[PDB]
Each structure stands twice: as structure tokens, then as C-alpha cells.
Design a protein around this ligand. Structure first.
Ligand SMILES: *NS(=O)(=O)OC[C@H]1C[C@@H](Nc2ncncc2C(=O)c2cc([C@@H]3OCCc4ccccc43)cs2)C[C@@H]1O
Ligand SMILES: [Zn+2]
Lengths: 311, 52, 490
């Protein structure tokens, strides 16, 4: 119809799930992905297979000696190469129909006009300040904003799709869902008697996230197993100061959490990257209710929890 | 008890009284859960998939 | 990266992946990136273009090659030091036996049907090796752990078809016409089967390869016999058409004189009649070079079933269906995407790490939902259940009871439709408890009833599969009241 016979042959099994119209909407969409570490690699692979029009992979860092020796998009021995450039050949070859590009500049340095060319923006490994900055930019221009990260056995996704309309099969019913700024998401008041009640049912992963975003802010990097003892002690201090500052008991997040939040675990990247990429696909094609607004995964317990936090 | 069985497809179905509950559903091969454990309140139904 | 003991285990032992498709490709990547340094991968298929939306180790240039082989080669391109052994082969093959299975500290299924899952289950019981089981379909999937003497096995819990009458005489749904078209294809070109008859049923309560050979497989003749002649003889059986709308026979000559994708459009009657012509010609030609087997992806076979069924639909006043739609239904196509398979493969490895870490107590059945349950859970972990003591597979000295007519049920029907199909044995040796009935190799001259063997209401048979190290005792109940050819007594 609106696609070639080769595309129809290629996409057959997903056309039979989400419909040709959903696929055509994918085919017109261009996505910015920042950060090509373990989770970015998974998101990249899933979006390219799905058959977006274009993906731009932005990473300003190089492959380091500390990075894993196996990375599915990067050949062995690429220490010192730019991580996006190192990912391009394998990423592109997953689906020649997708226009896969690479950008090597620091996301922070990007003017507001860099963003307007994209239907969706997905941030991995980015600081709290950058997440808030880019989410504000995307709101101005009505761009689908997403962020996610993995840390040891845990990970999370976040969406801000503004005021988001979609179809869903009860025949297709049109529905509307309203999202909130990431700043509000990350800065809940736990004073309210309402919030005190919401807290009892809020997963502690949300507090885990606050601790790790603060570590990232303070250290310029995430916890690393090479520096486990050093980073453990600091994480324990950050837990006290973060939760003390929100009027919550430190003990909500148990003191052994440090054992479970270091490094990128490939299976945790696969899980969080599959959930995040699928939310992106849903958002772009306007089909199915997207998770509003956080997904928290704990690979130790096998829990994945959607929380609505912010309003 | 005025109960609800929710399925993976979000299929909301009202009921009121291994048992008979399941027997009405099985006619519309499944597994039945109450807030965690296997079997105004909600019963979740899960189907086993065989694709791969 | 991992606790020392776990890391050593993972670098140390050998793991088996069964299937290199959607789940399997993802799982292979995850095992290697996680540090599993010895992997065997078996899959019996070659790469098809429709695989490419989710089976990410395969590119278009690889179409037609072995899944397992390409999978391994793709991985070695990003990690040359992986040790992977790839088999282009079925896990069902006798070479993969208990001692083969004994090699592994962990087996992981990445299969797409029950029969292979059953077989692997039995293999993992025999070898006492933990098995991670999983599946997906659309947006949904799940993972679970199977360990001998600790959990349910794959078949501890109970896991359809239509009557000849509805297919031969009384179709009411497109699926009856589709099933009919499928039967018609086998009867013409495939394996003749009585259970798959196409000519109207002369013995209905509500009331073929020979013939086509002798015409040199003439389009116009087949058409007339099937769409004209046969609907006339069905119009004889007057009782049926008092209630329901009569079928309208089709004249070949009368017919000839009468957006989504290409495949999604419903064509006119003349076109499917022509497509019936064309495909029959193509199939007659390639029946001479290479009994044929039906595959949804063989253009001509798919065309055949499409046209036959749509003609039959027209005859019985149903709206005709697009080839695309008939492909789902005749092929039983499961819609499938990258992300669901990626999430499930990720979970598989997490479960696996818990097992080899000696924390099976922490393993869970995990369902992946499309939407959060009431407690907000999109991934729903559940307790592992203990072995069902009345499981016909994993319990000690299993037995079951089958109710069949002893005089009118072949030794072929037992070997095939029962011990093989229903009970999922592969290399079964059956013996009457009192007289070897079926053999591993030999007893090819038994197929022609059971009655004439000493078999009667209350005789016992000992079924073995020495491959599966499985013994099932079957207790026999006689009856002639069955609908149907047998029932598993419940
Ligand atoms: N979910 S998916 O389709 O994306 O991927 C699933 C993969 C599983 C793989 N199947 C496979 N692999 C290894 N062993 C067995 C199997 C089977 O699925 C079955 C094989 C048989 C049987 O064995 C003997 C020879 C034979 C010949 C023809 C037909 C069947 C058999 C029965 S089930 C396929 C796919 O990549
Ligand atoms: Zn069992």
C-alpha cells in the first residue's frame, strides 16, 4: 500500500500484530537516541528492526578499557574509538531500510533547534540536569521525551508524551492520556497526607533512582565495580542525605542495596531496552496506552512496576 | 462476593457466587491469581504462550 | 561483574539453547555478553525473510542458510573468543540423548511448539539437568524454571479441531473452508489420510488421489468435480438444507464469463478460479521432480489453499477472504516482534544466574503483561509450584488410561495418533503386559486391529522411550460409544 513489497515481506509478523497503518507511522518517524552503552545498544537494535525512518545515535564518549569486552554493536578492540561510530556498521546492517546516523557532539552543547527534527527523543546515561533540560525543550516543541538507565540488577524507563492521543482495540477506540514534566516526576512532595498514603505503595526503586541520579550528579559518572568499596560508602551516605531530605526513613532503601546496583548487566539491558523501545514504538504509532510514567525493573525479584509519579 | 476477572487483554468480566468461576471462563488453558498466589475484588488471569 | 562463584560457574560449564529464532537469537547474545563461555545451539530451520524483523543475527544476505550456523557466525563477529557449537538439526534426533544432555549445567528452551517442549522436558528430567522454559506471542510471554524433584515439570499441568461433518458437508465459517482447502491439498499432492476426506460425507447424522491422477490433474475437471458436481451430490442430502442456506454449485464456464497491501485485497470469483488453475499447473509440475508437504511460504501451495477455500466460501454464501488473512489462518501465524522476545530472553538469563548461583528458591514464573495488573505489575512473578504427584510424565511409575474400540483401531493408529502424538514419545517401544507390539527399528508388518493381539478391556501395555528414559503404563478400556477414535480417560 504505502510500503514496498520487500518491506511488507520483512515486516509481515509485526504488521499482523499492530497493523499496516501503525507500521506506516513508524516508517515516517525519526528518533534521537543518546548514549550507546548497554541499554542504548538494545534500544537502537529494537527501533531499527521495527523500521523507524531514521535513528540518530548520539554519544560523545569513547570506548574505554573498563567497558565490556563483548558489545553486540561494537567489534572487539575498539578501545579509543567514538562509541557511536563504533556502533554504526552493525546497527545499520540490522535494517538497511532505516536511515541510521551518528552524532559525536555532547548533547548538552546542542541548540534547541537540533531537537526539532525528531519525533521522539530517548536519553540514556544522562545527568539529572540534562534530563530536565531536554525534557523542557521537548515540551516546547511537542516532542516525545523518554529517558532510561540500568544499574546492576535494576533499571527504569520514564516517559513524558505531554497530552497523548492514541487508538486501542476495545474496533479502535480513541483515548487521551496526560503526562507530566520530568522535573515534577523527580521532585514529589511526600508531605501531603495523600502522598504519605501513596508512599506506602511506591516501589523503593524510585528512591534507588534518586540515589543514583545524585551519585551521577556528584561524581560525573556512575558507580563502577572497579571502585566498589569507594562507591558503596558514598552510595550509603547519599541514601541517608537523599531520604533524610525528603522526610522518608533511610531504611526504606535497605543498606545492602549497594550490592545490587553496579554496572550494566546484559540481561537487564535487554529487559529495560525491550520495554523502553516498545513504549517508543507505541508513542510514535499512536497505538495502545503507554505507561504513565515510570517503569521500574528489579532483576533480583523479577518485578516490573509502573508508577505514576509527579502530579 | 461481586468479583472481577481481568485477563491479559484487559478483558473485564463480572462474576458473583479449582471451581466453577474458572469453568465459565475456560469456555470463553488459563491460570488464576489473587494478589500474588495461585487459586469487590479482582482475579487476574494469565495464559501460557507457545511462540518463540 | 558477577560474584566469583557464579562467574566461575558461568565461565566453567556448558549450556544448551534449543531454538535460534526470536527468543534464541536474543538469548544467545545475552548469554555471551553475560560471560557464558561454552554454548551449544541447536535449531533445525533455515533463515526466512519474515524472520528478519526480530531475529537480529540474521541479515537478508543470509536467507536460506541455517539459523544456528549464522547465529554463531554473527556472534563471533563481535566476540571472537566465544565457544559456540552450532547444530543444524532437530533436538528430537536420537543423537541428542541423556549423556548428551548430561554435559550441560543449564538447558534453555527457545521453541515454538509443544511437542519439542515435551521432548526436551523429558530429556532434562532423565539427565537431572535444570531447564528454563519460556514462550512469547505478540506482546505477551513468560519464563519459568523446571528442576527434577523440586518443581512441576512442563507437562504436570494440562496444556481445537472440527468434525468431518462440518468440513465435508456443513461449513459455516471461513475456517471450515480453509481447513477443507488444506485437506484438499494433501489429498491431491501430499499424504493421503482418511481423516482428511474432501468428498461429501455420505453417512452424516444431521442427514480422491485416484480420481485426479486419471484426469492427468486437469484444472477444469477438478474444478467441476469439486465446485459443481460435489455441491450437487451434497444438495441431494435434503435433510441438511431444511434449516440452513443451500450451497450454490459453480460452473467453470459461467465463472469465466462473469488500500492495504496486495495480499490484503479480496479478489473476485473469476480471479480465484484462475489462481486455482495456475497453481494446480505449477504444483503438478513440481510434484514430478520432487508426495509433497504443505508449507505456508511455498507460493503455489499458499495460492492453492487461498483459491480453493475462497471458492468454497463463495459456494456457501460467505464473504471471501484476502490471501493475507488466509495465510494467518492456514499457516497459524503467531504475530511476533523484537521487544517481547528481547524481554523474555533477558529474563531467561536472570533465572539461569539464580539457578547456577544455587538460589533456585528465588526463581519465579514471570508473566509479561501488556498492561499493569491492579498492583501495578507489568512483570508478574509467581511461586514455582511443586511436582504434581499425578503427572503422567514426572511421577514415579506413571500410568494413564485410554478408552478406544479394540477391534476398529490400528496398531498404526496407536503408534501414531496416541503414543507419538498424544503422548509425545519419539522412539517408542510398546509391549503388551502378559508380545512386542512396536519396535525402535522391524515390526513394520503390524500396522494392519489391536483386538487380534490379545488386547481387550483391561490389558496393559508398557511403552518405553529409552531416548527419553521414559516408561508409561497404559491401561485399556474397551468401548464402541466414542463419538472420535479415542479419549484420554479423565
Ligand atoms: N519462535 S521462533 O519461530 O521465532 O523460533 C523457534 C525456533 C525453534 C526451531 N525448532 C526446533 N529446533 C530444534 N529442534 C527441534 C525444533 C522444532 O521446532 C521441532 C522439530 C521437530 C521434528 O524433529 C525431527 C525432524 C523434523 C523434520 C521436520 C519437521 C519436524 C521435525 C518437531 S518440532 C525453529 C525456530 O527457529
Ligand atoms: Zn510432571
Amino acid at each position: 500500500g504505502g510500503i514496498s513489497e520487500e518491506e511488507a515481506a520483512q515486516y509481515d509478523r509485526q504488521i499482523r500484530l499492530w497493523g499496516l497503518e501503525a507500521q506506516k507511522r513508524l516508517r515516517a518517524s525519526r528518533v534521537l537516541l543518546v548514549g550507546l552503552k548497554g541499554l542504548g545498544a538494545e534500544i537502537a537494535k529494537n527501533l531499527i528492526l521495527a523500521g523507524v525512518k531514521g535513528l540518530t545515535m548520539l554519544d560523545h564518549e569513547q570506548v574505554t578499557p573498563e567497558d565490556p569486552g563483548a558489545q553486540f554493536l561494537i567489534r572487539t578492540g575498539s578501545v579509543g574509538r567514538n562509541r557511536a561510530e563504533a556502533s554504526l556498521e552493525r546497527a545499520q546492517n540490522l535494517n538497511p531500510m532505516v536511515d541510521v546516523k551518528v552524532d559525536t557532539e555532547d548533547i548538552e552543547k546542542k541548540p534547541e533547534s537540533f531537537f526539532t527534527q525528531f519525533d521522539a527523543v530517548c536519553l540514556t546515561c544522562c545527568s539529572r540536569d540534562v534530563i530536565v533540560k531536554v525534557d523542557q525543550i521537548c515540551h516546547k516543541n511537542s516532542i516525545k521525551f523518554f529517558t532510561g538507565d540500568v544499574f546492576g540488577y535494576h533499571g527504569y524507563t520514564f516517559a513524558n508524551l505531554g497530552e497523548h492521543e492514541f487508538v486501542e482495540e476495545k474496533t479502535m477506540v480513541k483515548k487521551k492520556v496526560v503526562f507530566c514534566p520530568v522535573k515534577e516526576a523527580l521532585e514529589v512532595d511526600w508531605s501531603s497526607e495523600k502522598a504519605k498514603a501513596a508512599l506506602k505503595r511506591t516501589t523503593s526503586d524510585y528512591f534507588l533512582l534518586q540515589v543514583l541520579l545524585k551519585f551521577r550528579t556528584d561524581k560525573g559518572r556512575d558507580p563502577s565495580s572497579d571502585t566498589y568499596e569507594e562507591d558503596s560508602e558514598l552510595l550509603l551516605q547519599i541514601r541517608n542525605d537523599v531520604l533524610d531530605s525528603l522526610g522518608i526513613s533511610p531504611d526504606l532503601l535497605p543498606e545492602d542495596f549497594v550490592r545490587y546496583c553496579f554496572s550494566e548487566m546484559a540481561p537487564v539491558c535487554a529487559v529495560v531496552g525491550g520495554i523502553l523501545a516498545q513504549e517508543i514504538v507505541k508513542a510514535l504509532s499512536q497505538r495502545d496506552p503507554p505507561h504513565n510514567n515510570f517503569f521500574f525493573f528489579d532483576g533480583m525479584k523479577g518485578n516490573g512496576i509502573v508508577e505514576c509519579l509527579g502530579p | 462476593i461481586k468479583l472481577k476477572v481481568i485477563g491479559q487483554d484487559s478483558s473485564e468480566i463480572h462474576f458473583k457466587v479449582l471451581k466453577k468461576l474458572k469453568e465459565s471462563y475456560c469456555q470463553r488453558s488459563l491460570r488464576f491469581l489473587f494478589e500474588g498466589q495461585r487459586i469487590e475484588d479482582v482475579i487476574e488471569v494469565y495464559q501460557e504462550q507457545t511462540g518463540g | 561483574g558477577l560474584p566469583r562463584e557464579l562467574a566461575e560457574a558461568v565461565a566453567g560449564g556448558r549450556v544448551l539453547v534449543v531454538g535460534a529464532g526470536g527468543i534464541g537469537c536474543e538469548l544467545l547474545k545475552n548469554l555471551v555478553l553475560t560471560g557464558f563461555s561454552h554454548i551449544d545451539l541447536i535449531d533445525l530451520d533455515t533463515i526466512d525473510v519474515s524472520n528478519l524483523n526480530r531475529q537480529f543475527l540474521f541479515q537478508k544476505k543470509h536467507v536460506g542458510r541455517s539459523k544456528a550456523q549464522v547465529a554463531k557466525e554473527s556472534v563471533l563477529q563481535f566476540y571472537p573468543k566465544a565457544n559456540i557449537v552450532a547444530y543444524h538439526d532437530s533436538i528430537m534426533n536420537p543423537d541428542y540423548n541423556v549423556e548428551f544432555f548430561r554435559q550441560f549445567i543449564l538447558v534453555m528452551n527457545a521453541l515454538d511448539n509443544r511437542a519439542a517442549r515435551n521432548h526436551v522436558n523429558r530429556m532434562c528430567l532423565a539427565a537431572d539437568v535444570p531447564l528454563i522454559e519460556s514462550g512469547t506471542a505478540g506482546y505477551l510471554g513468560q519464563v519459568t524454571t523446571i528442576k527434577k524433584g523440586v518443581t512441576e515439570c512442563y507437562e504436570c499441568h494440562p496444556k481445537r479441531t472440527f468434525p468431518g461433518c462440518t468440513i465435508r458437508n456443513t461449513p459455516s465459517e471461513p475456517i471450515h473452508c480453509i481447513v477443507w482447502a488444506k485437506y484438499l491439498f494433501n489429498q491431491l499432492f501430499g499424504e493421503e489420510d482418511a481423516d482428511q476426506e474432501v468428498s461429501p460425507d455420505r453417512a452424516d447424522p444431521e442427514a480422491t488421489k485416484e480420481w485426479a491422477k486419471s484426469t492427468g490433474y486437469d484444472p477444469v475437471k477438478l474444478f467441476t468435480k469439486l465446485f459443481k458436481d460435489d455441491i450437487r451430490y451434497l444438495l441431494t442430502m435434503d435433510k441438511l438444507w431444511r434449516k440452513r442456506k443451500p450451497p450454490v454449485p459453480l460452473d467453470w464456464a459461467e465463472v469465466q464469463s462473469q488500500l492495504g497491501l496486495k495480499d490484503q485485497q479480496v479478489l473476485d470469483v473469476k480471479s480465484y478460479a484462475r489462481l486455482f488453475s495456475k497453481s494446480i499447473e505449477t504444483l503438478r509440475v513440481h510434484l514430478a521432480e520432487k508426495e509433497l508437504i504443505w508449507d505456508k511460504d511455498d507460493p503455489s501451495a499458499m495460492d492453492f489453499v487461498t483459491s480453493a477455500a475462497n471458492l468454497r466460501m463463495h459456494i456457501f454464501s460467505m464473504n471471501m477472504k484476502s490471501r493475507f488473512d488466509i495465510k494467518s489462518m492456514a499457516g497459524n501465524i503467531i504475530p511476533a516482534i523484537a521487544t517481547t522476545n528481547a524481554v523474555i530472553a533477558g529474563l531467561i538469563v536472570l533465572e539461569g544466574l539464580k539457578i547456577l548461583s544455587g538460589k533456585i528458591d528465588q526463581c519465579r514464573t514471570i508473566f509479561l503483561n501488556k498492561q499493569p495488573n491492579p498492583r501495578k505489575k507489568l512483570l508478574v512473578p509467581c511461586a514455582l509450584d511443586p511436582p504434581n504427584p499425578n503427572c503422567y510424565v514426572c511421577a514415579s511409575k506413571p500410568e494413564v488410561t485410554v478408552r478406544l474400540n479394540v477391534h476398529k483401531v490400528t496398531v498404526l493408529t496407536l503408534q501414531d495418533k496416541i503414543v507419538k502424538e498424544k503422548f509425545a514419545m519419539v522412539a517408542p517401544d510398546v509391549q503388551i503386559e502378559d508380545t512386542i507390539l512396536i519396535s525402535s527399528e522391524e515390526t513394520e508388518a503390524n500396522n494392519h486391529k489391536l483386538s487380534e493381539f490379545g488386547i481387550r478391556n483391561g490389558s496393559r501395555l508398557q511403552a518405553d522411550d529409552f531416548l527419553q528414559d521414559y516408561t508409561l503404563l497404559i491401561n485399556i478400556l474397551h468401548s464402541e460409544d466414542l463419538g472420535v477414535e479415542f479419549e484420554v480417560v479423565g
